[PDB]
Amino acid sequence: NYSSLNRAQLTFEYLHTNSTTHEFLFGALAELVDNARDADATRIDIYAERREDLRGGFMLCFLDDGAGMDPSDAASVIQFGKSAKRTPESTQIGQYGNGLKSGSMRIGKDFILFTKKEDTMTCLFLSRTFHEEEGIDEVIVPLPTWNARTREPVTDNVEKFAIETELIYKYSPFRTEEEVMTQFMKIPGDSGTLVIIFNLKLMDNGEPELDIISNPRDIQMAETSPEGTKPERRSFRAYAAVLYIDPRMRIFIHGHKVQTKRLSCCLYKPRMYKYTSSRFKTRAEQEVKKAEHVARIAEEKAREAESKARTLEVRLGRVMLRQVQNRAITLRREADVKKRIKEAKQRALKEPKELNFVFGVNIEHRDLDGMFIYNCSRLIKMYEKVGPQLEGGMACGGVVGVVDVPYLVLEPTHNKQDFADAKEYRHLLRAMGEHLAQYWKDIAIAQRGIIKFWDEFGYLSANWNQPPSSELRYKRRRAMEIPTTIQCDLCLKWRTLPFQLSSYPDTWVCSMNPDPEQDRCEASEQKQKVPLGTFR
Amino acid sequence: MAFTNYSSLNRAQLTFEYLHTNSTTHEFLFGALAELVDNARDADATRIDIYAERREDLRGGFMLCFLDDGAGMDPSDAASVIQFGKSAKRTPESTQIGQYGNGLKSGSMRIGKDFILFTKKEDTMTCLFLSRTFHEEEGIDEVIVPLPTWNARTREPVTDNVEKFAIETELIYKYSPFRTEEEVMTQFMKIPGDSGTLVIIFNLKLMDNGEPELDIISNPRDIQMAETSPEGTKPERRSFRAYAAVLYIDPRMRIFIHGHKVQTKRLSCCLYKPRMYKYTSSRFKTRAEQEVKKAEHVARIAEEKAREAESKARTLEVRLGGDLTRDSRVMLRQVQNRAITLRREADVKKRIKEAKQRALKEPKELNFVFGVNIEHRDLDGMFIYNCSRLIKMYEKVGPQLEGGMACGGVVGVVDVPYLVLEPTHNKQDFADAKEYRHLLRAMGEHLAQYWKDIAIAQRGIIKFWDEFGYLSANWNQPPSSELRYKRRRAMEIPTTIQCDLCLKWRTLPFYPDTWVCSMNDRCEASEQKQKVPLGTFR
Ligand SMILES: Nc1ncnc2c1ncn2[C@@H]1O[C@H](COP(=O)(O)OP(=O)(O)NP(=O)(O)O)[C@@H](O)[C@H]1O
Ligand SMILES: Nc1ncnc2c1ncn2[C@@H]1O[C@H](COP(=O)(O)OP(=O)(O)NP(=O)(O)O)[C@@H](O)[C@H]1O
Ligand SMILES: [Mg+2]
Ligand SMILES: [Mg+2]
Ligand SMILES: [Zn+2]
Ligand SMILES: [Zn+2]
């Protein structure tokens, strides 16, 4: 029993320390998007609610129709490091038990979250305003729960519940129980979550860092954009569109749909190269050696306990007989379950241990090139130049590369904007650069003449940065090379259209497609067939 | 200042897995080691020894030890180590590097699974033991930390709870590298002064081939990354000896690696024709003004309260003119002493305010220094320090962002105060990207002015580099090693060296172990400052 020993604890200032991980402000917003995706949301709305009395003049709201949280799920939010998603073979993005706290506290001073699941709905209120005004150096968090159907409090301590709600009514944007219930009612289904960040951070001139005015359909960085500034680093609509390699969840900003995309579907002559990863193989082999030791120990424990149970039965020829017998039963089921996981890791070990590099030419935007590196579907690095692109030449200029890296090979840094194992990441970039050179040889556009290739798509200007010509002949020349893809708003499937779109998307559903083969939500989804190239 | 009793409410808590989460901030492994070096400098150490202790029974084969002779920690200071976010350093316009209440924990847990720290101060010695091995083995999901303290002279336990002390020490003997009290005391004996700290990180992380990430074998005087170094690899990204040498803009603390002194340096003193440009910072001035206004308010309130108590002491004394009772005597003394206390406090706040007002009138400028790296022209770009600690190195700006020879070879240095920029969580970037980008743009413009001011076009560029021994066509290749060319570069950059005794920096007119002023020539010849000529921008 360790009850007298010191525990590590979190203090108020740590909320700030943790938030300084996000020098890229959109990567703080991405944490909350990730959480909606991981909760199996089919939709997230990211929108502003104007509030001239709050710092920055609006609250930033994230509303999803995902699985929601029950009261114990909600309470584990403030157990830093706790992540039910951190399970073997987990393909959730969440793993570190931190992102909502680091991201929200980068964006604003305070947040209030509303969540509903089955018959409960819970509010979690993180108010740094409260801690400052009342001199609190711990991190104290109101967490009231109500019954979702009757709106009665669900609490084991009515005095505590009264203090919690009084704090919410005093310090949150919502000053009455009615106003709080109004927020719960914005979650219209049986489950979902609404996260509201408020008292947003200001620049030195008193304006918020997030600009929702310049383009009312977007969330932009409030800073001047130089010449080669990437759209994804100043427009959240642009960043959200490529945040996942395999978008399904629909994203809306200020009520306007984001045209999410699969980068490999947006490129000229996409080709895929399979890269055998020694790291992937070694780590899978070690995860097996470990599972087989874990199953071995459990079996010896179960075998001892069963032996003692049998001997005690014959000796007794009671109460204690069942402590021994059931202990044997439980160790045996423990041993069997670990043997099954050992076997499952052995089976997976035989699968190919390969990373799939995909390359194609960004003919619409030659200057937006380099590698996009995803980690368990989540974008980590964008526009990373490799191989010949690291020279001052036109070789491999315009080429976009995409790869999805599993956690066994790389895990992210604390801010999910870099990779924690720099040595192995640098190795990956060299491997990607070698394959990029092979892609470039393979499509041979440099053997035939690289300037004349770009001329054909209408790059009249001498500066590498300006867009290709917008006259009609060059528009159609470019468009002919890139299929038109679109997601159904009802069934979430990805479709191709046999014509070109005119221009911010509106609602589209399968039955609007003139293609008789994709004409109904019940028609099965066609997969991109990216052709395979060969290294060396 | 709480409205009610909040003891029933939920607190946020730290769990075991967060130690790992926190450590993933350090993708640059040397940045995790730098956290511990920063703590030693902040504790006013005159020396830190970073060394390996071979232990074939522990993961990675050795423990990494950080031994300093700084101010150490008493038991309450040690307990606050594990209050994440708590930092007594976080004070107005601080010149300590620490401010976030995290670096020891993020850095140590990047490097290894476990650490044990020994520290001495005044009459106490304390051990702090962070054992992820213990947590895994016993299934602990909180973060539980043994923190025993002994009397430094008698070695008797200093504790409020002898049962807790026995549990704490037995955890250390079970899970740490030191399995008896005697072995622990041997570690305290390595702190030979009245104060200091020894941090030992062990069960080091391994690469897939089973070897540690840190290579202490290839060069037994260094700590290197166990990785191949391709062509464009900077020394400070592969050699901890190289990194440590430039980690601080104004080195004082001596650094030893495996017992061998690091030749720390001031980058601005290693360059050809250094020039300084002053850049006015509006944020620096605005923020310093707000800090003065806060101190003015604090002083004014304290003066009001002191005058109130002083008035009451005067009027109460007259009201008790004829009164000889013990009651009236004790109550008059109570208010008289309260007036004395508040007057002393008011006079302290006044002095604090007046010091801040005087500091406010100093120029609120950043100092950019530029020079040509004629010894290694490929090692160029900007070195950006923050409260004297290196954050960004080799950052190319201005003309250097083009293809060309313009500003090739130029190194720039700037020390940014905390009022202007603060660092990211891993102290390897800046938290305010917008303002950092503004600073880079300004540095690039001043760089272009520097290149005009030294006017290499006048003598010609090709011939400039040829004269210092760069006859080869390639940019990446080192300059000639002929005697003529070594001396020609040597006349342009005076050799400086630090005295091992007094820590002063001195200049020599023209070794690996030690050097002192009398080898030049006495330690209290006042330290001479290089005057860097002033340029103007536009
Ligand atoms: N939108 C949401 N819907 C449902 N559950 C959520 C949502 N946001 C947060 N959660 C829950 O809150 C927990 C903590 O979230 P967070 O702090 O982001 O850590 P994490 O997602 O588990 N790991 P990471 O994001 O990698 O640090 C999650 O594990 C979920 O259980
Ligand atoms: N070598 C040391 N000598 C003396 N005190 C030390 C030493 N190392 C750590 N400490 C103490 O431990 C505290 C916590 O260290 P740390 O976790 O590094 O946070 P910090 O230094 O205060 N700020 P930061 O490094 O920016 O996160 C410090 O504030 C000191 O009080
Ligand atoms: Mg998360
Ligand atoms: Mg520190
Ligand atoms: Zn459909
Ligand atoms: Zn000296």
Residue numbers in the entry:
A (entry chain A): 5 to 321, 329 to 514, 519 to 551
B (entry chain B): 1 to 510, 519 to 528, 534 to 551
What does the paper say about this structure?
Microrchidia CW-type zinc finger proteins (MORCs) are a family of transcriptional regulators conserved in eukaryotes. We recently showed that human MORC2 is necessary, in conjunction with the human silencing hub (HUSH), for silencing of transgenes integrated at chromatin loci with histone H3 trimethylated at lysine 9 H3K9me3. MORC2 is a 1032-amino acid protein predicted to contain several functional domains including an N-terminal GHKL-type ATPase module with a coiled-coil insertion (CC1). Here we report the biochemical and cellular activities of MORC2 variants, alongside structures of wild-type and neuropathic variant forms of a MORC2 fragment comprising the GHKL-type ATPase module and CW domain.
We obtained crystals of human MORC2(1–603) in the presence of a molar excess of AMPPNP. The overall architecture of the crystallized MORC2 fragment bound to AMPPNP is an almost symmetric, parallel homodimer resembling the letter M. A 2778 Å2 surface from each monomer is buried at the dimer interface. One AMPPNP molecule, stabilized by an octahedrally coordinated Mg2+ ion, is bound in the active site of both protomers. In the wild-type MORC2 structure, the ATP lid (residues 82–103) is in the closed conformation in both protomers, leaving only a narrow channel between the bound AMPPNP and the solvent. Residues in the lid form a significant part of the dimer interface, with Ile82, Phe84, Arg90, Tyr100, and Asn102-forming hydrogen bonds and hydrophobic contacts with residues 12–24 of the other protomer. Notably, the β-sheet in the transducer-like domain contains an 80-amino acid antiparallel coiled-coil insertion, CC1 (residues 282–361), which forms a 6-nm projection emerging from the ATPase module. A tetrahedrally coordinated zinc atom carried over from the purification was observed bound to the CW domain. The orientation of the CW domain relative to the ATPase module differs by approximately 180˚ in the MORC2 and MORC3 structures, with the degenerate histone-binding site of the MORC2 CW domain facing toward the ATPase module rather than toward solvent. The CW domain binds an array of arginine residues in the transducer-like domain: conserved residue Trp505, providing the ‘right wall’ of the methyl-lysine-coordinating aromatic cage, forms a cation–π interaction with the sidechain of Arg266.
